[PDB]
Each structure stands twice: as structure tokens, then as C-alpha cells.
Amino acid sequence: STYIGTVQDVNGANIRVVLDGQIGSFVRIPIGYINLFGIVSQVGAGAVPDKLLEVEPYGHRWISVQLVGEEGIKKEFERGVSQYPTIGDKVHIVTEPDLKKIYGTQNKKYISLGNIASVDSIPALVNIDTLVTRHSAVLGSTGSGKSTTVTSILQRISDMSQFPSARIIVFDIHGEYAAAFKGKAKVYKVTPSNNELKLSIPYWALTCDEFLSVAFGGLEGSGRNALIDKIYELKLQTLKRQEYEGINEDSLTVDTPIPFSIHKLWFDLYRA
Amino acid sequence: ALLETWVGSEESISIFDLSGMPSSILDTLIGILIRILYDSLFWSRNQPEGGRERPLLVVLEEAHTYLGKDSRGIAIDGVRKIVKEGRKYGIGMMLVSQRPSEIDSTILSQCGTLFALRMNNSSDRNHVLGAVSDSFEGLMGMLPTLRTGEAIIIGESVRLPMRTIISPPPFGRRPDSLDPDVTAKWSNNRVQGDYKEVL
Amino acid sequence: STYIGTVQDVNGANIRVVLDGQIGSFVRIPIGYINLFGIVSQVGAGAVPDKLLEVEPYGHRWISVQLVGEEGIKKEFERGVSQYPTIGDKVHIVTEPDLKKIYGTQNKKYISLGNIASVDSIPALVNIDTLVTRHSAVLGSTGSGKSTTVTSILQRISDMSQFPSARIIVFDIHGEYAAAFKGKAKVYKVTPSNNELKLSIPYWALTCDEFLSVAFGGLEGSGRNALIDKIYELKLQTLKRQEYEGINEDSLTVDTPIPFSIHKLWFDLYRAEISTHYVQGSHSEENEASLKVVPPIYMPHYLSNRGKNIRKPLEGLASLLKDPRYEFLFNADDWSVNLDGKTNKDLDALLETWVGSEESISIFDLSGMPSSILDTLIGILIRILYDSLFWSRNQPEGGRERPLLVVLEEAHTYLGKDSRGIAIDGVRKIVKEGRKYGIGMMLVSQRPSEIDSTILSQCGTLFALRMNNSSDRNHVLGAVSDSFEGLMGMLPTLRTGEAIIIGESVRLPMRTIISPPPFGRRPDSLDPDVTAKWSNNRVQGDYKEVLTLWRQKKVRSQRIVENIKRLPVSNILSIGYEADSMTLEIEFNHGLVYQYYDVPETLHTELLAAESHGKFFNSQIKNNYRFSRI
Amino acid sequence: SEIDSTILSQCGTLFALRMNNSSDRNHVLGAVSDSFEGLMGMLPTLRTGEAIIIGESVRLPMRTIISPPPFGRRPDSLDPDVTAKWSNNRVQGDYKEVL
Amino acid sequence: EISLKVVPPIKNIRKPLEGLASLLKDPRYEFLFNADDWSVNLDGKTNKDLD
Numbered sequence A: 001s002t003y004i005g006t007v008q009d010v011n012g013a014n015i016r017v018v019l020d021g022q023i024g025s026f027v028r029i030p031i032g033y034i035n036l037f038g039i040v041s042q043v044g045a046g047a048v049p050d051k052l053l054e055v056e057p058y059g060h061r062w063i064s065v066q067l068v069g070e071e072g073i074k075k076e077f078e079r080g081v082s083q084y085p086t087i088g089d090k091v092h093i094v095t096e097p098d099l100k101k102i103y104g105t106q107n108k109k110y111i112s113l114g115n116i117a118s119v120d121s122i123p124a125l126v127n128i129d130t131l132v133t134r135h136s137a138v139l140g141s142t143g144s145g146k147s148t149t150v151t152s153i154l155q156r157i158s159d160m161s162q163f164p165s166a167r168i169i170v171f172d173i174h175g176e177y178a179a180a181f182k183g184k185a186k187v188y189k190v191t192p193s194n195n196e197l198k199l200s201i202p203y204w205a206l207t208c209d210e211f212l213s214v215a216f217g218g219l220e221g222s223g224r225n226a227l228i229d230k231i232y233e234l235k236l237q238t239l240k241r242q243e244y245e246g247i248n249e250d251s252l253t254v255d256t257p258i259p260f261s262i263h264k265l266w267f268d269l270y271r272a
Numbered sequence B: 001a002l003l004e005t006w007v008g009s010e011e012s013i014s015i016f017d018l019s020g021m022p023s024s025i026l027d028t029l030i031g032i033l034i035r036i037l038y039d040s041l042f043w044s045r046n047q048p049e050g051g052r053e054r055p056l057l058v059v060l061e062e063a064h065t066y067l068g069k070d071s072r073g074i075a076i077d078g079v080r081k082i083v084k085e086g087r088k089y090g091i092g093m094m095l096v097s098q099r100p101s102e103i104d105s106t107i108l109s110q111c112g113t114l115f116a117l118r119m120n121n122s123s124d125r126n127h128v129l130g131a132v133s134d135s136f137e138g139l140m141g142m143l144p145t146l147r148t149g150e151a152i153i154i155g156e157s158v159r160l161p162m163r164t165i166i167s168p169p170p171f172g173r174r175p176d177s178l179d180p181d182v183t184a185k186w187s188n189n190r191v192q193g194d195y196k197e198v199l
Numbered sequence C: 001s002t003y004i005g006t007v008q009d010v011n012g013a014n015i016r017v018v019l020d021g022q023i024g025s026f027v028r029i030p031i032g033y034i035n036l037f038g039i040v041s042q043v044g045a046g047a048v049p050d051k052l053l054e055v056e057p058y059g060h061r062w063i064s065v066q067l068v069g070e071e072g073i074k075k076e077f078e079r080g081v082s083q084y085p086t087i088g089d090k091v092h093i094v095t096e097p098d099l100k101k102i103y104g105t106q107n108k109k110y111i112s113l114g115n116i117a118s119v120d121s122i123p124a125l126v127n128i129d130t131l132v133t134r135h136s137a138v139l140g141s142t143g144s145g146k147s148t149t150v151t152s153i154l155q156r157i158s159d160m161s162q163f164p165s166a167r168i169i170v171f172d173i174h175g176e177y178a179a180a181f182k183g184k185a186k187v188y189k190v191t192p193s194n195n196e197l198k199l200s201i202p203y204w205a206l207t208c209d210e211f212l213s214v215a216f217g218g219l220e221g222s223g224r225n226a227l228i229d230k231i232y233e234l235k236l237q238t239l240k241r242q243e244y245e246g247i248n249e250d251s252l253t254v255d256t257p258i259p260f261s262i263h264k265l266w267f268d269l270y271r272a273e274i275s276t277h278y279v280q281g282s283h284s285e286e287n288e289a290s291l292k293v294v295p296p297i298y299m300p301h302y303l304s305n306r307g308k309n310i311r312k313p314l315e316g317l318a319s320l321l322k323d324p325r326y327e328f329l330f331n332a333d334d335w336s337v338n339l340d341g342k343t344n345k346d347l348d349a350l351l352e353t354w355v356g357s358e359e360s361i362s363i364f365d366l367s368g369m370p371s372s373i374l375d376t377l378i379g380i381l382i383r384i385l386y387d388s389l390f391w392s393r394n395q396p397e398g399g400r401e402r403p404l405l406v407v408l409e410e411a412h413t414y415l416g417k418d419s420r421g422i423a424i425d426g427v428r429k430i431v432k433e434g435r436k437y438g439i440g441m442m443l444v445s446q447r448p449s450e451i452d453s454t455i456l457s458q459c460g461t462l463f464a465l466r467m468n469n470s471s472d473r474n475h476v477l478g479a480v481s482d483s484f485e486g487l488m489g490m491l492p493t494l495r496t497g498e499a500i501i502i503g504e505s506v507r508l509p510m511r512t513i514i515s516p517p518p519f520g521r522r523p524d525s526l527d528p529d530v531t532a533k534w535s536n537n538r539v540q541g542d543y544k545e546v547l548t549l550w551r552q553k554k555v556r557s558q559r560i561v562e563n564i565k566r567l568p569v570s571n572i573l574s575i576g577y578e579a580d581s582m583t584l585e586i587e588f589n590h591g592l593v594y595q596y597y598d599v600p601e602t603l604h605t606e607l608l609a610a611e612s613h614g615k616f617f618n619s620q621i622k623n624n625y626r627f628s629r630i
Numbered sequence D: 001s002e003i004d005s006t007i008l009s010q011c012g013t014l015f016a017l018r019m020n021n022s023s024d025r026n027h028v029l030g031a032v033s034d035s036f037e038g039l040m041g042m043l044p045t046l047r048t049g050e051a052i053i054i055g056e057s058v059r060l061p062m063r064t065i066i067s068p069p070p071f072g073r074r075p076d077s078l079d080p081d082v083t084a085k086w087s088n089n090r091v092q093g094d095y096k097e098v099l
Numbered sequence E: 001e002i003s004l005k006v007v008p009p010i011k012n013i014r015k016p017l018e019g020l021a022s023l024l025k026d027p028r029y030e031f032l033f034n035a036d037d038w039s040v041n042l043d044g045k046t047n048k049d050l051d
């Protein structure tokens, strides 16, 4: 069989089992008909109770374990605890079928993005409905391999067998992803290439503030009150000289993505 | 047609390469693209093209420079609105950065799930521990000693936190930046110089 | 008789027991004639005394004696004990009848919500006056009960057979509670639905300071004093034209709720800022050379001498009146104010509708609110409710004779320790001066640490769902009136739904399993489903429309059909059709109604004769036509 | 626990009643030199009305049961009653005056 | 710097002055500015003495 030890303490959730057990490995605790799964926290002198070493200063065989969830009556793994364990109970190791049970899921919203540390055959199912709706963030050191873990995920999301209608945008500042997606993406950049289109961001698709923030460096006096007057005038004429549905002489604002000629702005404003 | 290329192409993923940008304005553009992608999806949440029928996902590299705790840029304003109202219109987001402690703490906490790769300096680890909710005491004292690509995922996107090992992309599909190779570019015999053209 | 162990040694407080038992479970100790019920969180390995460990260190069966309350003289259970245990006495497990008496009561004051963990048959009796007069809070992790719990309490308190005059209000930023209350609640949202009203907050019912905090960003100059001067004349002028009872020119104030036309404000203020002056130095309007926002053209220009440095807010304000996203505040539908400042109705209907509806609950879903000014409006709504019941506390409709219960969802973003918003400046008052007017409060937040401590100190009782992180457990435990060590140690492992109630609204802190509401009556949020939306095949998009709407700031395509009739039948409820324009309208559960276009009506007949709906609708309609959902 | 300890010490005699939370039971102990286990070990199980007196104004400290005052002379705040005012049948109101 | 007064209508501590005026008009503070017997007239005499 597989035996670790016995529970020699209880505090509701925090438990301190004594052996006769890896730092991250789970622990299984049957109680009659349902089992409690737990997480190790520390090892050695960190798990010893406050008042034991006085008589046995060098008795170090203690481990601290924590409780995460509980398995129902052949139904599923439900978080929490139906009935907490007590002193002098049994303990068992988490074996291969159990890992499937705890981590398994029959729902179809989950997708496999990796393998757990202990057993390599376990898919690392992570919800995608949640990963795209709540939010996500990748953090780490510099050489820890972020962009490689942002492609091994961002490449499994847009698969063409399950998600033929996916949709994604990327912002790479060093240009290190275009090499990964050879025939799966539409790479954009400033310098054209043979099969890469050239990023183009029309200057008239911008609000008044943002255009004033990239072009004129930020004006605050009457200059800011003169440029706005001109842009409005230009977007007035383009409406008279060409037809755009819906936009009228009143619904038109300074910040509607309507085309205006920047060169005419500088030339006419500067020439005057 | 412009939008059709960014979002409506026949290939799913778009990739915007900004390494050529004049970096004095690199921040404002990140706040320009997010605004256009957000308004276009937000204002057409009925039609079959909006974010309610094809949910979006914006991934941002090196987010610690534009999401500073006291940054005065325009990107942080955009990254806050999508962090706040995106759940209604299905516009998620992914954040990448190697300096967590420089990220604003009011934006880093509103991210449901976190990938926790290696972290050594204690000004970050003590700051990541300040935003993750289901924080175990056995799997979060393990941050600085992970392997490369041995991420830890904690949040509600998983039933419970897991210490996964992401599968690397197939060889030849990896991300590779193209920087000049000094050892291979300095070691060759000197060639006759023609500096007339350089002027 | 369940014998386990007996006492054999004494160490002052540690009373040592040799054995021959759940953690948060009571123990019974009879002493002659009076029974002692209480908690002993120290037993076994965690209780063996340090003095004796030298003898037997490898054994753990030892208990201690410290109680909570004593059984009276066959009367009832009260906290405290007349006498403390002694030598020789033995501890017995509690029995179901004892649970009935300890948690039972003969008072009709209490109400039942959930059940005790041990035996489900027991009811979970919770006071109501203290649950509405002493305020309270709800706390726990993100995935625990949380909202599924708040609805059950409001769905039990607001029963008509037992409380036929209840009165409460709910703030739900995600708008996830309107689903549970199918037709028993009012629900106001910015963009209406088939049978829902408009959450219109008339701007003329705001204090001047709050008005300048939503429309001008906090002007802090001489111009700020120009607006106050300008608004006063409008508010003063409307009084002289229309008589109002009890206020005249003398006792008029800048902050009293008299309607005024903002359109006149911006137009007169904006026009008197820039215009040609026929005669130099003349500020008269006769020297210059309205239902719609259209301004008349002005000739080129000297400039008016009556102006200031408020050009940016004044032009920025004009924009706030254009976009439809703020239509609720500035274009209150039935409270829209014409140019002369005379609207159709007054706040009577607003108050009569918010709190005076024939049905008990009212709901304000704020998902449609722009998150920039979400905090500012939260404070505004609180002020209106408190003040209205303040100066009318003797009347027969106020809060004294019909107390209120304002519920706030997701509060941790609004009561921050360093938060400088107006919400906390409004929430503090009710927690302080709301006791003697009967204005309650229920706080919800998934992360208590950020909540201001003084606010969390003054709440009467606390609901404690599961809480994972250690940083927050320590903060919430620091504002507990009556805490148990055996009960609060299992806070990070509570299963979903069941909560722990602590405070003055119950006799004892108890671990209750709140009854889940009926299936189909739950708080559900209808957010887009990626897995069901990304998996379907591609569809050639027509972006020429997406651009057009994005330009027009509209949300409905110009090809919609409005006057179609429907006939009742995954769970398809109603199906429409129209051969004139080849439009097929369908309706599903949760009120979702689409409009598929250019579909042959042969399928319409086939579906009616298909008698196989659900499994057959996806056969030839799921992704085969262009639909403009509504 | 929140009160300033600077002003607490100068007080001569202190009456202490039922104290449940462990956080505050420690602070009160710090303002009394007579650290007696029996006096304060029984603090968290004191019945309503009970008290323990410590200070110079009392010759010897011990627990006493204060006799409650007679009915008709008893503190009670006249806060509105929720269940009594919600239980009564709903009555049509007129907000023309409340406004 | 410039009805109950006979005159017909025509330092940076102004906003205190308006805030000061709020207390005067409010009936809820009349216990302090408008004491039942202790209000001070322009002549300066009070109907009673603090003794």
C-alpha cells in the first residue's frame, strides 16, 4: 500500500501530519466513505508544534499540510470539507487515478495547455471562457521564458480544428513572434517585406487629443484653440464634397473618424 | 477594409510589430490601437461581427513600462477600461512584463488568473503575493526556483492553483528576435571602408 | 451514553483528560442539575500540556474546560455560566434536542435562513431588527456563495405573507440579480428592455458640489464661481415663473432641488463667450450679429468681453450632452426638462417608484454605467435616499415607520482606506446617523483588506463565506465582536454556499448552510460565451455596417423590423415569421430574441411541422444566415 | 483596544464585563498591575449585568451581580422596530408632502 | 467689495462666507445661532445674561 503517516493536529483547516511527501505534492485523507485532499506547506522544523521540542529538541519528522477540497459520493471533487479530520486518522498518497479525478473535467470549456509537474500524462486543463473574460497576466523574470509561454498558449487558442472563428491581436515590441507564426498569422510592421503587410494607422482615425499628443507635442494656449477650429473646418468640407451616410452638419464632431488632408492643414495654416 | 485586415482576416491571429516605432511616441500608439479596437467592438455588440459573437483577446508585451503606478501616459487609461468593462463585451487581455512591482496595483489586482514564472527580486514577489487570492503557502514559496517555462497558474480560471509545465512550440516555430551577432560580426577580417555613401 | 474520556489532572486552566468530535461542534457537560454547553477548541495533540509532555510526548488525547453559556433552570440558554466545572465531571456529546433548545427560541422576532451543519432539520434563526438596524457585511472569496447568498436572504425577508410591507433596495454592478427575481422585483437599467424602466437620475436633483464633480471634472478657479452664480439665477428665476409651496426667494438655496434647464445654461454661457460685437465694449445680447442642439451660424470676428478661461470644460461639456452613453443623466426620459425649466413631473414619481412601488424590491443594475463616474453616482443615490427619509421621519411613509435596507455589491473598490471618492463620505453617515432613522446597510466585497477599517468596525454583524488569502483573514478577524477560535480556524475551507454568521444579530456564532434558491431562480450574468462562439464556422463579415454604427454611435442596425407579432410555442419559447421581408424572429430563454434575415418561409413551415425543435433548429439555421440580434 | 492607552492608565477603578475577542482581553490586562488569572480568566463568560471591580475605590476586587433597576426606569433607545413596522399591511402613501 | 435691508438690489475667504451663510439659514442649527432667548440684536444687548 501507500502510507505516509498520521494526523497529529487539527485547527479547522491547517493540519500538521507526522510521517510513519513532496513539498508541492497533494495528500489524500480518506474518512469512511469520502476522502480529503490536502496541500503540503512546509517540512522539518517549520511544522513542529509550538510546545514539543522542549523535551525533544531534535525530533524533526513533522510536516504541515493544508486542506483544499473533498470528493463527494462518486459525484465530483467539491471544494471545502464535509467533516474535518480528527486526531489519529489514516493518510494515503495521491496516486495516478486520483490525479485524473481531482483534475479531470467533463465540461467542454476547458483546453489542455501543459502537464503537471508530478505526472506528465495529465493535461493541464485551464478554462478558456474565464481566461478570456475575467482577465490574464504573465509575470516572471527576464530569462524565464514569457514570450515562449505566450505563444505555446496563444497558438493553441487559435487552432483551426476546434476554433475556426477565433480572434486575437498581439503587441510585440521586439518583433519576436512573427518568426513563430510562419503560416498562421498576418504580420504587420513598418518596413514592408515579401509576405508581410505594412502597418498603416491613418492619422484621421484619431481623437483630437491623441493627434495633438503625437503631432504637436501638446499645445495649451490659443494654439490648441486654433488647430481644433481648422480640423473641424476640414471635416466639414469633406462632408460637403463627398457623401457619408448618417453624419450631418450637426452630428459631426471634432473626433469622428472622417478623412481630412493633413498636408492641407500645415500648408494652409503655415502659409497664412 | 482596415478593420477587416486587423480582425476580419482569413487568418485568426494578428501581429503588430512595433520594434520599428520611434520610441518617443511608442506609448501613445498603444493607447491609440486599444481605443479603436474597443470602440469598434463595443459599438457593434449586436451584429455578428462584434465581441459578443467572436470574443477578442489583446496581448501586450512589456506592460511594466506603460502601466506604471504613476505613469502619465494614455496606454494606462485604455488598459484600465478593458480591465473594467471588458467582461460585458468579451474583450479579455493578457499582460506580459518582467517587473511586476512597477505595475499599478489597482490594475494588477483585477486580473482573474496569473501565470507566475521565475521571480528573484523581493520587491516583486512581495507584490505578486499582494494580489493573488487563492495563495497557497507551499506553492508560492517556490517562485524563484522554477525552471524556464515552468509556470504556476493561480486564480479562478482553474479549479485550484496548479504548477504546470507548458509544452514548448515545435522546433522551428519558436519566437526568435533578429539582433546583430557581434561575435560573428566583429570577428571577420576588416573590409575596405566606403564612407562616402554613409554620408 | 457516548463515553470518551475523563479528567485526571489539573494545571490551572489546562484541565487534563485521559481518553478511553468535530472541531466547531459543541460539547455537553452536566453538573448535578445544570447543563453546560460550549466549545473546547483545545483537544488531543493540540491540548496536551507542555508540563507533562516529558512523560508521554507521543500521545494525543486530552481536552480542556472553557464554556460559552449555561442552561437556565429548565427555562432557556443564556451566555455565561453560573459555575465552572470541577474534578471528576465527564463531557458528553450534544444531542439533537439540545441543539433544538440551544438554537431554538420562542420569539417571533427571529427568521430562518439556512440550517446547522450537523443536522439539517434545525432552522437557522437570525434576528431581523438587528440585521437591518445595526448594519452588516458579506465577505468571502470570489467563487464562493457571495451573490447566491445575498439573493436568498432578500428572497426570504421580502416575503409578502409574513412581511407584506417590506422595503429594500439593491445595488448590483454586474446586474446579476434581475434573473433570480423573474417578476417580483423592479429593475432599472440605462438601456431599457421589453418590460423594464429607465434608471434616470435627474441632474437638477443634485447638490451643486456633486454636479460640478460629474460634468466639469472639478473646476478649481474663478470660473468655478461663475457657474455657481449662473445656476443660481436660473433656479431663482424658475421660482418666480412657477409657484412652489414653502420656498420663496428669501429661503432659496443653490442646493435645493428646483428643476432648471441645463441646455439654456450651456447655450447662453457658450454664446456669451464668443461672438461678434457690433459696438465695442457692449455686453448686451442685442448687439450680437432652440429645441434642437443645432446652433445658428455666427459671422466671423470684436470678441466678447464677457468670458473666462473655462473654454475647455465648456466645450467638453457640450460633448457630454451628445453621446448616448450618458443619456440617462442628462436626458431623463420622463423628467426631460424643456428650455423654460418646466418638466412634466417631479421626483414624486422617482421616489414613489424607487421605494413606493407596490412590490417590495427595487434593483439598480449599473453594468451599463461608464466606470469612470460609477463611484460618484453611487454616492449621489445614497444621498437622495437618506435625505428624503430624514426630513420626513415623522410622516407615515418614512424609514421610522418603514425602515430601509440599502444593499451594495462589490464595495471594496469604493470604501478604500485611501479612497477619496464621495461614496465613502456618504456611506459613513448612514453607518453613524442611520440607527435612529432605521436606514440599514449590507456590504459585499471579495477582498476586505482594502475596505476602510472604521467602516468595517461599525457594522453590526458579519457574514463570513470562504476566504482563501491570509492577508484578508487577519483583517476581518480584527473587527469581530464575538469570535471563537474553534470556529474561525475553518474559515479558509468553507464549501460553497454555507456561511458563518458572527455579530449581534444572532445569539451565537453558528455555521449555517443557507438554503439555495429554487432552480431557475438564481442570480445569473449573461456574458458572451467564447467556447460556444469561437467553435462555430466562419462567416463572411460585412464590416461596412460596423464602421457605420461606430460612426453614428448607434447600437441597432437600420434593417430592423419592429411590429411583428409572435405566438408561443435549446429551450425555444416563441417563434415569429414574416414573408413580406423574409424575416424570421426567434425567442429563447432569458428573453434573448434574434432576427435572422432573408430566410425562405419553407423552413418556417418545416419547423412548425418539424415538432423536433432544439435538436433540429441548428440543422439549417445556426450559421447559415445573416442575423442582426436584438 | 482602539482607545489610547495614555489616558486609560490614569483612571483609578475599572469595571470589566464579558469580553469574548482575545484581541481586547489582552489590552485591558495591560492597564492593571494586579494580573490575576482568576479575575480575568473568567472574563469571557460573564453573565449579563455581571462585573468585576478593580481599583482603589474598592477595598478588594471580586465579581458582583449589579441589581437591575426597576421596570419603567431602564435605558432603552427608541429606535424604530423593523418587523413590527413591516409586518403591518402595506398602506397607500402620498409623497406630494414628503417632497 | 460691493430685501430685508432698506437698500434696493444693485480677502480670499469668500467660500467660507457662503458656507457661513448655510448655517444661518438652516433651521437645524437654530439651537446655536438662534437660541430661544440668547440671540444677539444689532444693539448688542441680550434679553438675558449668562450669569
Ligand SMILES: Nc1ncnc2c1ncn2[C@@H]1O[C@H](COP(=O)(O)OP(=O)(O)OP(O)(O)=S)[C@@H](O)[C@H]1O
Residues within 6 Å of the ligand: A141, A142, A143, A144, A145, A146, A147, A148, A149, A152, B148, B149, B166, B167, B168, B169, B175
Ligand atoms: N516552454 C519552454 N519549454 C522549454 N524551454 C523553453 C520554453 N520556453 C523557453 N524555453 C527555453 O529558453 C530558450 C529560448 O529562448 P529564451 O530567451 O530563454 O526564452 P524567451 O521567452 O525568449 O525569454 P523572455 O525574456 O521571457 S521573452 C531556450 O533555451 C528554451 O529551451
Ligand SMILES: Nc1ncnc2c1ncn2[C@@H]1O[C@H](COP(=O)(O)OP(=O)(O)OP(O)(O)=S)[C@@H](O)[C@H]1O
Residues within 6 Å of the ligand: C141, C142, C143, C144, C145, C146, C147, C148, C149, C174, C176, C409, C446, C496, C497, C498, C514, C515, C516, C523
Ligand atoms: N448553495 C449552493 N449550492 C450549490 N452550488 C452553489 C450554491 N451557491 C452557489 N452555488 C454555485 O457556485 C456558483 C458561484 O457563483 P455566485 O453564486 O454568483 O458567486 P459570485 O461569483 O461570488 O457572485 P458575484 O456577486 O457576481 S462576485 C454559483 O453560480 C452556483 O453554481
Ligand SMILES: [Mg+2]
Residues within 6 Å of the ligand: A142, A146, A147
Ligand atoms: Mg523577454
Ligand SMILES: [Mg+2]
Residues within 6 Å of the ligand: C146, C147, C148, C176, C523
Ligand atoms: Mg454575483
